[PDB]
Amino acid sequence: ASVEEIRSLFKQFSSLTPREEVGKIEDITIPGSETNIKARVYYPKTQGPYGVLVYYHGGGFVLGDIESYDPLCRAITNSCQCVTISVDYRLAPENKFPAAVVDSFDALKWVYNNSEKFNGKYGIAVGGDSAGGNLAAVTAILSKKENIKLKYQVLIYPAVSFDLITKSLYDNGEGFFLTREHIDWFGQQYLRSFADLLDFRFSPILADLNDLPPALIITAEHDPLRDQGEAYANKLLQSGVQVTSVGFNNVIHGFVSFFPFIEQGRDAIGLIGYVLRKVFYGK
Amino acid sequence: ASVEEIRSLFKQFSSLTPREEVGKIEDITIPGSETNIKARVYYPKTQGPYGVLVYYHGGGFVLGDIESYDPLCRAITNSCQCVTISVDYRLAPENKFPAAVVDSFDALKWVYNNSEKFNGKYGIAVGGDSAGGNLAAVTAILSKKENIKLKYQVLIYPAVSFDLITKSLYDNGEGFFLTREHIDWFGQQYLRSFADLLDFRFSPILADLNDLPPALIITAEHDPLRDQGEAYANKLLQSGVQVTSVGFNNVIHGFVSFFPFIEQGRDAIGLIGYVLRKVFYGK
Numbered sequence: 001a002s003v004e005e006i007r008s009l010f011k012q013f014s015s016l017t018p019r020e021e022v023g024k025i026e027d028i029t030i031p032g033s034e035t036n037i038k039a040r041v042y043y044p045k046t047q048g049p050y051g052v053l054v055y056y057h058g059g060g061f062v063l064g065d066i067e068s069y070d071p072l073c074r075a076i077t078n079s080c081q082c083v084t085i086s087v088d089y090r091l092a093p094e095n096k097f098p099a100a101v102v103d104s105f106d107a108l109k110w111v112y113n114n115s116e117k118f119n120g121k122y123g124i125a126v127g128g129d130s131a132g133g134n135l136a137a138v139t140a141i142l143s144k145k146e147n148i149k150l151k152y153q154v155l156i157y158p159a160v161s162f163d164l165i166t167k168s169l170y171d172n173g174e175g176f177f178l179t180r181e182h183i184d185w186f187g188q189q190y191l192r193s194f195a196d197l198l199d200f201r202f203s204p205i206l207a208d209l210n211d212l213p214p215a216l217i218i219t220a221e222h223d224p225l226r227d228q229g230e231a232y233a234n235k236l237l238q239s240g241v242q243v244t245s246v247g248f249n250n251v252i253h254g255f256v257s258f259f260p261f262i263e264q265g266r267d268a269i270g271l272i273g274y275v276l277r278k279v280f281y282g283k
Numbered sequence: 284a285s286v287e288e289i290r291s292l293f294k295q296f297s298s299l300t301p302r303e304e305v306g307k308i309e310d311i312t313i314p315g316s317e318t319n320i321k322a323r324v325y326y327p328k329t330q331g332p333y334g335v336l337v338y339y340h341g342g343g344f345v346l347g348d349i350e351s352y353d354p355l356c357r358a359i360t361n362s363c364q365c366v367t368i369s370v371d372y373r374l375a376p377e378n379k380f381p382a383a384v385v386d387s388f389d390a391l392k393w394v395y396n397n398s399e400k401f402n403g404k405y406g407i408a409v410g411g412d413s414a415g416g417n418l419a420a421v422t423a424i425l426s427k428k429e430n431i432k433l434k435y436q437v438l439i440y441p442a443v444s445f446d447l448i449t450k451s452l453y454d455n456g457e458g459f460f461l462t463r464e465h466i467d468w469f470g471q472q473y474l475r476s477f478a479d480l481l482d483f484r485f486s487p488i489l490a491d492l493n494d495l496p497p498a499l500i501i502t503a504e505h506d507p508l509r510d511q512g513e514a515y516a517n518k519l520l521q522s523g524v525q526v527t528s529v530g531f532n533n534v535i536h537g538f539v540s541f542f543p544f545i546e547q548g549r550d551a552i553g554l555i556g557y558v559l560r561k562v563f564y565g566k
Binding site: 214216230233234237242243244245246247248249250263264266267270271273274275278 | 497499513516517520525526527528529530531532533546547549550553554556557558561
């Protein structure tokens with residue numbers, strides 16, 4: 001299958017997954033520094049004011065998009081009772097690193113600076129899964145540098161480092177959906193050169209993690225990325241940031257996308273909904 | 284310190300803790316097969332009908348009680364929006380095994396048979412922490428044997444087997460609050476003879492776990508009981524029961540009791556609240 005064929009397959013497979021009703025949906029265009037960034041705004045069924053979660057889909061920086069991630073963002077919106085804004089950041093290999101990062105940060109900054117459009121008086125969080133978790137994490141680092149004060153970051157099995165050494169990478173690098181071969185190939189599509197392996201915007205574990213927002217970090221037992229997720233939680237904790245780091249057992253990378261039929265995914269979405277309701281609303 | 288003093292220190296420290304408002308509290312006395320069993324019934328602030336969680340406190344079969352667990356049970360009640368019934372089962376060494384089990388199951392049967400008293404139309408679940416998670420699990424096994432249909436079981440770092448072999452026992456058996464010496468001492472207070480190590484009512488891992496209620500099993504990373512909790516989840520899964528097994532990283536046995544200070548305990552209570560709202564209310 002071509003990259004285009006796989007991008008299409010993601011959208012097709014999404015139509016098998018039920019889309020929860022939400023309050024109201026709007027498609028908007030965010031004026032970025034390098035491009036106009038499509039985003040989809042989901043309102044919950046409750047009355048505002050709201051907190052706002054800026055969400056970055058996963059897909060190895062190459063795949064996925066607002067449509068294929070529409071069922072998951074509806075479910076998150078209903079769970080957190082919060083406005084969710086799903087960002088269509090530029091993809092590789094058409095747009096190399098750091099295009100995804102530039103778009104992700106530009107979208108966050110715009111949302112932070114325009115939160116009243118969404119009645120977003122209870123503050124802004126970031127979240128994402130896999131490569132999207134990488135972008136949420138990097139966006140939070142970049143926000144600190146610009147004095148943008150986020151409430152929370154939700155990192156769902158994030159990619160946080162180039163890795164040739166964790167035990168989970170070797171234990172779980174074949175047979176569990178996301179393989180070594182995929183991880184290598186995505187990296188080749190996304191990065192410009194070996195030097196980018198020194199860049200915190202690709203490997204956020206490299207950054208100084210002091211003063212970042214408090215985090216929920218979800219890892220999966222049978223996931224080659226498990227150990228590096230835990231490492232990111234640990235380095236946050238060592239840096240004085242509050243982190244709830246939870247390993248969901250018996251599940252594989254991606255499991256939250258498969259919530260309709262992997263019940264642990266549904267429960268993960270319930271946990272995400274709880275922490276954001278707590279941080280935004282005191283509930 | 285005598286048993287009395289150890290109990291009183293526990294009650295002392297729990298006295299300090301702000302208690303969340305709930306809807307309504309009723310103390311009741313359940314006519315048990317061997318004793319009168321005090322229970323405390325917590326109503327949420329929502330209106331009914333309800334699900335009902337029958338909850339067994341931890342404390343190594345020797346300590347804890349309704350009063351000392353009152354702050355936790357209030358928090359759980361508000362999180363699950365469900366009627367919570369905290370059971371004052373008989374303690375060891377005064378009452379040896381299987382007294383705690385007899386009381387825990389007698390209470391559950393009585394609640395099940397009297398569900399209308401609590402407006403409990405959405406069914407009955409069991410839950411507990413530590414020794415209380417042991418009692419919840421054993422109660423669910425005994426319920427199946429007598430055709431009592433429970434909705435769910437919430438096992439919070441349960442004790443499920445006598446253990447001289449798990450890696451977590453050796454890695455975490457000192458320095459993390461619950462020690463080998465404590466495990467030994469509680470078992471000595473509770474059990475009558477070595478024969479009781481063969482009894483599934485002490486080590487529920489021995490039972491046939493087919494057809495038991497779906498479960499949420501929470502384990503703690505730095506807990507000597509971590510691996511045996513995971514084993515219980517995995518044995519349930521092998522036996523066709525749906526289980527969400529979540530390891531909370533960076534925390535120790537008992538962490539949910541410390542929710543006012545350890546934010547991961549609060550988030551665990553959120554998760555417990557979610558799964559029970561889901562199973563009772565579809566929410």
